[PDB]
């Protein structure tokens, strides 16, 4: 509703929700955003003038991940504060339940970009609390509309699990999950569990073992196994019943429909480690 | 502390 449209790089995009841009820009219907620094401006002329002075061609942070034309930048809210507050204002136009936009200092923002000769273009991001008592491995996650349904959301979800698993603790997305989040996370969990069971043939695996190998918390694995119809209960606790054709057919579909956008652990420049 | 979807 307010603003209703934004210009961002080579696209004009309809907003889904209101975001609290400053009073002067609040009642403005269309905002012009710089695609590199995320500064909000009132007109195309002001944007064109800004683009001549703007020195950034990628987010103001170091590249934690790079493979082919894809990068992830680890942006610290306590360091690139203005950029992160501008990113939060941008994300609120597409996340109805994101409430944090100003106190960004306790958060990290993993900004995903698709790169070409004009720079590192922002595709989306996920934020995470540096220290979360609930072990939420993602606070908010958003892929811009023109980049949705291309495997970027799965990439970022998988990246979030790579970090929380390398730091030895299972995590889960912060709730509530949007409708798209519910579909996306379940598809991720299902694909991960199925590919994990395929590679662990010689092991009567358990929810606990699946949780350690994947970083997915036990309750989310339990829900996923319930969705896959691989749970049974006789007496004390759930037993996993493998549905072999479900496992074997998923792996066959994966071998023909490759995952072109896929997190390669060897392409992280720095990875978490539990300190001695 | 409180996250980005923390009810306000
Ligand atoms: C709090 O922040 C957590 S919940 C809110 C986060 N997202 C949100 O609502 C903001 C707007 N949406 C997004 O940013 C975006 O849609 C995501 C991040 C929710 C999902 O990312 P992608 O759009 O890039 O998803 P993909 O990685 O391409 O898809 C993975 C699988 O998810 C299922 N899926 C996704 N969109 C679907 C729709 N519209 N309908 C059905 N199923 C959908 C699919 O299984 C998809 O895999 P496919 O192989 O089928 O493509
Ligand atoms: Zn700029």
Residue numbers in the entry:
A (entry chain A): 507 to 782
B (entry chain C): 10 to 17
According to the publication:
KAT6A forms a 4-protein complex with BRPF1, ING4/5, and MEAF6 to acetylate H3K23.
While our efforts to obtain crystallographic data for this complex were unsuccessful, we were able to solve a crystal structure of the MYST domain bound to a H3K14-CoA bisubstrate inhibitor. Such peptide-CoA conjugates have been utilized to interrogate the binding sites of acetyltransferases so we evaluated how H3K14-CoA, which consists of H3 (5-23) with the ε-amino group of K14 covalently attached to CoA through a non-native acetyl bridge, is bound to the KAT6A MYST domain. The structure of the KAT6A MYST domain with H3K14-CoA was solved at 1.72 Å resolution, with interpretable electron density observed for residues 10 to 17 of the H3 peptide, the CoA moiety, and the acetyl bridge between the H3K14 ε-amino group and CoA. Comparing this structure with prior crystallographic models of the KAT6A MYST domain bound to acetyl-CoA and NuA4 complexed with a Htz1 peptide indicates that the CoA and peptide portions of the H3K14-CoA bisubstrate inhibitor largely overlap with acetyl-CoA and the Htz1 peptide, respectively. This observation implies that the bisubstrate inhibitor occupies both the acetyl-CoA and peptide binding sites of the KAT6A MYST domain, as expected. The structure shows the peptide portion of the bisubstrate inhibitor surrounded by three loops within the MYST domain: α2-β7, β8-β9, and α3-α4. Within this crevice, the bound peptide assumes a β-turn, resembling a type I conformation based on dihedral angles (ϕ, ψ) of G13 (−90.1°, −6.9°) and K14 (−118.1°, 5.3°). In addition, we note that the α-carbon atoms G12 and G13 are in proximity (3.3–5.0 Å) to several residues within the α2-β7 (autoacetylated K604, L606, and F613), β8-β9 (E635, S645, and C646), and α3-α4 (E680) loops. Steric restrictions within this environment provide a model for the preferred acetylation of lysine residues adjacent to a GG pair given the small size and conformational flexibility of glycine. The peptide portion of the bisubstrate inhibitor is stabilized by several putative hydrogen bonds, including 8 water-mediated contacts and 8 direct contacts with the KAT6A MYST domain.
